[PDB]
Design a protein around this ligand. Sequence first.
Ligand SMILES: [Ca+2]
Ligand SMILES: [Ca+2]
Lengths: 103, 96, 51
Amino acid sequence: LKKLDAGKQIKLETTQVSGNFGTKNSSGQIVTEGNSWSDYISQIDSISASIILDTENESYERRVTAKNLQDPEDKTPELTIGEAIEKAFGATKKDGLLYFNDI
Amino acid sequence: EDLDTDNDNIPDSYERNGYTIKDLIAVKWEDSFAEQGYKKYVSNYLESNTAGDPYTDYEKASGSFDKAIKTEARDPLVAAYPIVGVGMEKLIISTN
Amino acid sequence: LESNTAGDPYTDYEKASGSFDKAIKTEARDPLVAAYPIVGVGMEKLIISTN
Ligand SMILES: [Ca+2]
Ligand SMILES: [Ca+2]
């Protein structure tokens, strides 16, 4: 409790976030149960980069597939950083500069 | 000499002599192939999964599984395997 | 271009046809008026004690 008075900050670390997504069943019925995100989480983080936006009222984080030039059998497209950003946040090119809405 | 016994989608002469994966089909091994960056795979044509893990020799070389798998485990002889121990960081002793 | 235009589990046909759970309010038969239960919990009695 004395480490708070010196002004050190309490961190709220939150690990694994088990949950579900919604698929379209063969009867037009959206189902949530059995569709564990944590199944695909391990995959995506492996082949991707992590992109975050500050936007000082609310933050946005995205994941985008990378190429890994050292594999010939990965026929995934290749992206420069600036190219990734505009697709990861729906950004626009007003003048070649990238704009979020007007930022 | 172009027939698959273990049905792993890899003909026996390929598995026995040498093969890599191109466009997700099994083609035979050439030494000029290593230039672009392919790897030389060779496995047991008498076993669905040569390494013994739940993934077949095809799947391993193809890379068509859980992509978080370390790349060396794509070799049908390097078994995909999670090795987990529990380490300790803080040691607190008390009398309460 | 959509199985269920409104987004609810019922298809645009089913909505207009009225061939579903008949307790659905009739305006929700319009494939644009989403069938939707909106439930809050109200309070009637407020008792405060020290026990
Ligand atoms: Ca085999
Ligand atoms: Ca075989």
